[PDB]
Amino acid sequence: PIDQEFDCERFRADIRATAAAIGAPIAHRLTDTVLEAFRDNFAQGATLWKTTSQPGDQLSYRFFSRLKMDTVSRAIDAGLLDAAHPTLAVVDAWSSLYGGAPVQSGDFDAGRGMAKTWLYFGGLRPAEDILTVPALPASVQARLKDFLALGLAHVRFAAVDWRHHSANVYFRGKGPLDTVQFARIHALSGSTPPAAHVVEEVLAYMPEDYSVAITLDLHSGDIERVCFYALKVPKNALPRIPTRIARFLEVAPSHDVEECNVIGWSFGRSGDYVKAERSYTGNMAEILAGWNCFFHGEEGRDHDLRALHQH
Numbered sequence: 001p002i003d004q005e006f007d008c009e010r011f012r013a014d015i016r017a018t019a020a021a022i023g024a025p026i027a028h029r030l031t032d033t034v035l036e037a038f039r040d041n042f043a044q045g046a047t048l049w050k051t052t053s054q055p056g057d058q059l060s061y062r063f064f065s066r067l068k069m070d071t072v073s074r075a076i077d078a079g080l081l082d083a084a085h086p087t088l089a090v091v092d093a094w095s096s097l098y099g100g101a102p103v104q105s106g107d108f109d110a111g112r113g114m115a116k117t118w119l120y121f122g123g124l125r126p127a128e129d130i131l132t133v134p135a136l137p138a139s140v141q142a143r144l145k146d147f148l149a150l151g152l153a154h155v156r157f158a159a160v161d162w163r164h165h166s167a168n169v170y171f172r173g174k175g176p177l178d179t180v181q182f183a184r185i186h187a188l189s190g191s192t193p194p195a196a197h198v199v200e201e202v203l204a205y206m207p208e209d210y211s212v213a214i215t216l217d218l219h220s221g222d223i224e225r226v227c228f229y230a231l232k233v234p235k236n237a238l239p240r241i242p243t244r245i246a247r248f249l250e251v252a253p254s255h256d257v258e259e260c261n262v263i264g265w266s267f268g269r270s271g272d273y274v275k276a277e278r279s280y281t282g283n284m285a286e287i288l289a290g291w292n293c294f295f296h297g298e299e300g301r302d303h304d305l306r307a308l309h310q311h
Contacts, residue, residue, distance in 0.1 A: 031108075090167070140217075140219075151174060156171070228264070238261070
């Protein structure tokens with residue numbers, strides 16, 4: 001097809017093609033297994049592409065869910081996730097919060113299969129509710145005070161990395177983000193402070209009430225990476241980007257009526273990189289707006305957040 005709608009056969013071809021275009025690995029049978037197990041999730045949700053500037057990095061593909069279901073159980077059913085995985089208890093605890101309000105989405109790598117389980121928690125959730133579930137060890141729960149001291153008091157998403165027993169926890173803070181607050185957040189990673197123009201550019205791309213994704217080791221509580229990102233950046237307003245990201249944004253196909261590109265700056269001890277996502281089918285921008293995400297060039301004031309901070 002050439003139209004906007006998700007089509008599974010075209011998606012198979014586009015995964016192979018896009019992976020070849022950016023020099024990413026491919027696992028043919030494994031990809032077919034993912035597509036068979038999660039076809040309806042991809043069809044009903046927003047399906048989109050992701051990669052990073054690391055040479056040879058995986059082509060990733062994600063569904064953001066409209067169909068609410070136990071995606072982890074499905075993944076286990078399909079042989080895509082170990083039934084004994086030690087991170088299952090945390091994911092079950094987070095999914096069960098608020099009477100089961102959170103909704104699971106899924107991230108996959110063309111060369112490795114299931115990569116991450118995402119949770120959208122259905123609102124501005126107190127950090128305490130997320131970071132003190134009994135499934136988390138004391139060393140992880142102990143980081144709560146560090147987040148609260150930075151004003152990172154509400155969580156909107158968590159992306160659980162099954163390969164690394166880590167979670168990227170997505171906070172929203174009352175901003176604007178300034179040089180010092182960036183420095184305090186970046187310092188959590190333990191990585192070398194960037195030069196001032198790196199920071200100036202990130203700040204230029206933030207909504208007033210900013211997001212940050214913090215990488216948390218779910219055994220030790222160590223933080224070795226933080227990420228700031230900008231949603232639905234128009235191609236003529238892109239920040240400076242690595243040539244691999246520019247290539248990705250040129251070759252990964254988007255069929256959405258409203259194109260949605262995402263740029264993320266990831267800072268961590270193992271090395272910094274740039275992340276990018278690009279819409280494919282099923283209206284990425286719509287689902288993000290419904291989750292109260294803020295887009296580039298729009299008002300990014302969170303009035304609910306500002307009420308919660310006033311109390």
